[PDB]
RNA sequence: AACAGUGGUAGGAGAGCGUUCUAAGGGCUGUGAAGCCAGACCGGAAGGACUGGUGGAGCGCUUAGAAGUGAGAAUGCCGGU
RNA sequence: UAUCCUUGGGAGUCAGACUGCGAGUGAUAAGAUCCGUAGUCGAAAGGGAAACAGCCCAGACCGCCAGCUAAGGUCCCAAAGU
RNA sequence: ACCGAUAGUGAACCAGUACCGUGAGGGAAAGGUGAAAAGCACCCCGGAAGGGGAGUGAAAGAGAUCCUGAAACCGUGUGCCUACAAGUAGUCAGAGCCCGUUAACGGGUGAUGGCGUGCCUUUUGUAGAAUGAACCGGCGAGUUACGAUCUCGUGCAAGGUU
């Protein structure tokens, strides 16, 4: 392993599924959390059980 | 890569006479000639037609009760401004708008419509001033 | 490390203005209005690449009408004739290219007229 | 009393047709040779019609 | 050719395209006189600059001042002075003083 | 003057004229024969769907490049859909020769 | 190679583009970089160059890593108009 | 013909519309409302119904200046038989 | 593997000032000439302001809110088009005229024709007479800290690991 040619074992690294940048990738406007729900607002919502 | 003729058109002068026919079917195949759709070099946008002279327009006929029924409605812009004219009114008072208005609907609308519409003229009786162009005689398909 | 984001944008907004020449008035120096017009052109430039499959037929077929009425035939009796005259493939564009050589066109027409009868 | 839309750069610059102003009636001073206003006193000459009037 | 710029004397430019849409193309020896009975007062700036524009062609260039025609005389606006006029019921309208760069290009006929 | 079928399209063909025709199985120095010929013209010899017999008009393949660039930007107006795909259509610069009339 | 399929919102899944910073190599610059300004170049796409003109000191690539990670809409903030 | 089930990560959806047949509510009134089963639309552009989510045809990888049909059309706008 | 002047302390600069408020308090804006002030003597225009020359400096378009200087916007000129056409302003056909570029099925105008009702949010449903934005530029929204759980991946494995 040279410093010029660093690489992982394929499957040990995986890029971000980063949320809310443009409608092209998907997850653009709603950002993965749908339309107007309680489960879309700023932290407001439900306990687990 | 077709041929789009633009102002390289040998235009023509046909005369269609109005002896005893119906003005729908007498304006029918004239209106194709006004755009020249019978001519093989038909571009759809550079007015490939040719000029049409109609003689004896007041002697044109209508079956049914259309001599009394088909009221020709023009309208002003002032309120309540329709002016009704019946067919026999148009027939005898002045018929030189009676075949023009039957073709103004039949030529396609736009700037090119009026540009093709200048090729038309209609003379009451047997005037035909037009002794300087050698006009031809056309006979419709029916 | 913080991103300034200086020249990520200003390179992109002029890849839309340089696709926006010639427009009327204030649609060639604005991003927010020409970008509603580069998009709107895209449907138009798409859906009017398929009317050249249509408004060329409508340009080709009436010329074949016009070649037929100097022969007494219809558009029907030509194309129904040519299916029986030969089994010919003459693809209405290039049918007009024989029309502008009309001396040779009517040998294709009257052969079908004989095959009409 | 509200402009419903902004004025574009056509209908603005079609309103500055009859906002132009001309050159006034301008003749030549018959005595001191310079350009004179019509029917007033050529102030370089100080004259009008025959007389440099004091 | 010659060149002379007024450079940031205070007048509003849309009160200075008007008289400047007469002067261009004219004879310079005539345009001193056209700029004299204007009555609009965006002229004693310009007439005090066209008279300066001739002198550059006469001193620095000696180009026979009776044979000159203005080819370009274009007015472009300069930096502004922002005021706050007080108004009705606390409204504080903005009055924009404008300033313009009257330029004059003199060339031989 | 030939009317030859190459890629399902036909062209009114004059000998000695370059016609932009579809991509095919040559390597820019070949004389590919076109056999689906009809309405030879000039002497007005047609054959009605057989081809004209023994008349396989050749050409000479000059160049195979791509077209001027066409980009589709097909957006659906509401509901947030874009689709941005370029398309370089390849062709073959065909120099036509040898009418085999 | 053969056969088949390719409209898509919410929604899941997979590939890549690019900015800032660092990391080893390499190079490229006062014989003119970054930026800016223009075009008719190429890549399927985000895109990427190549001459020309500005500018007067720095910045790309190859592979990696870290992210304040990319705008056109918030009765958006702040200037300029 | 290949799609089911099981285990597990991840969701969104829980306001729907209309046309035909099968009912209720109504006045056998609504482009009304409450459902049944079936469509389309929602999320589906194209063609006709002059234009028109919801009816009648039909699903769009992308290019050509080629070919055939469906719904509907063939005197002229507006392509095709007076 | 911090920021580079709208960022970073509110405050890189006479900043807790200037201003707002009787008041407790609130609380801005604004850095860059060159390497060296050598920063324009001298001649003209005008009362200057301000130039045009000259001279300085490698650059003076570098000359006093002084590096680079985009867009809004204001323009001055000219190539092609327009005063019988309705026209989300384009597309695609398309002559004429004007052209000669990162040399290739070119560049720019387009008389005229055919199809054609913006983007976004929210909706059963939108060109909408439902909202949102005068445009122009910059900033501005799913992040880490700790633990849970699953897949992918690593090393040892009936022992792994501090």
mmCIF file of C-alpha atoms (C1' of nucleotides) in Angstrom, chain E residues 3-7 17 24 48 51-52 55-56 59-61 74-77, chain I residues 43-53 61 63-64 73-77:
data_model
loop_
_atom_site.group_PDB
_atom_site.id
_atom_site.type_symbol
_atom_site.label_atom_id
_atom_site.label_comp_id
_atom_site.label_asym_id
_atom_site.label_seq_id
_atom_site.Cartn_x
_atom_site.Cartn_y
_atom_site.Cartn_z
ATOM 1 C CA UNK E 3 -11.462 63.666 -26.044
ATOM 2 C CA UNK E 4 -12.782 65.562 -23.031
ATOM 3 C CA UNK E 5 -14.709 64.308 -19.997
ATOM 4 C CA UNK E 6 -16.621 66.418 -17.481
ATOM 5 C CA UNK E 7 -16.213 63.602 -14.891
ATOM 6 C CA UNK E 17 -29.409 62.766 -22.567
ATOM 7 C CA UNK E 24 -23.885 64.793 -31.860
ATOM 8 C CA UNK E 48 -18.359 74.734 -20.423
ATOM 9 C CA UNK E 51 -15.487 74.856 -25.040
ATOM 10 C CA UNK E 52 -12.898 72.878 -23.074
ATOM 11 C CA UNK E 55 -9.038 73.780 -26.577
ATOM 12 C CA UNK E 56 -7.537 70.306 -26.249
ATOM 13 C CA UNK E 59 -3.489 73.370 -27.850
ATOM 14 C CA UNK E 60 -2.584 69.694 -27.495
ATOM 15 C CA UNK E 61 -3.459 68.780 -31.088
ATOM 16 C CA UNK E 74 -22.242 60.262 -24.496
ATOM 17 C CA UNK E 75 -23.387 60.782 -20.922
ATOM 18 C CA UNK E 76 -23.005 57.945 -18.439
ATOM 19 C CA UNK E 77 -24.163 58.193 -14.848
ATOM 20 C "C1'" C I 43 1.313 73.866 -20.796
ATOM 21 C "C1'" C I 44 -3.557 74.701 -21.926
ATOM 22 C "C1'" C I 45 -9.701 74.793 -20.789
ATOM 23 C "C1'" G I 46 -12.757 76.998 -16.808
ATOM 24 C "C1'" G I 47 -13.986 80.978 -11.056
ATOM 25 C "C1'" A I 48 -13.046 76.230 -9.953
ATOM 26 C "C1'" A I 49 -14.652 71.377 -9.869
ATOM 27 C "C1'" G I 50 -12.854 68.519 -13.623
ATOM 28 C "C1'" G I 51 -9.997 67.038 -17.457
ATOM 29 C "C1'" G I 52 -6.534 66.735 -22.228
ATOM 30 C "C1'" G I 53 -1.365 66.631 -22.941
ATOM 31 C "C1'" G I 61 -7.068 52.220 -18.001
ATOM 32 C "C1'" G I 63 -3.744 59.087 -9.675
ATOM 33 C "C1'" A I 64 -6.695 59.351 -3.840
ATOM 34 C "C1'" C I 73 -28.786 48.738 -14.563
ATOM 35 C "C1'" C I 74 -27.663 53.320 -17.427
ATOM 36 C "C1'" G I 75 -25.640 53.319 -22.084
ATOM 37 C "C1'" U I 76 -22.901 55.413 -27.293
ATOM 38 C "C1'" G I 77 -22.357 53.196 -31.970
#
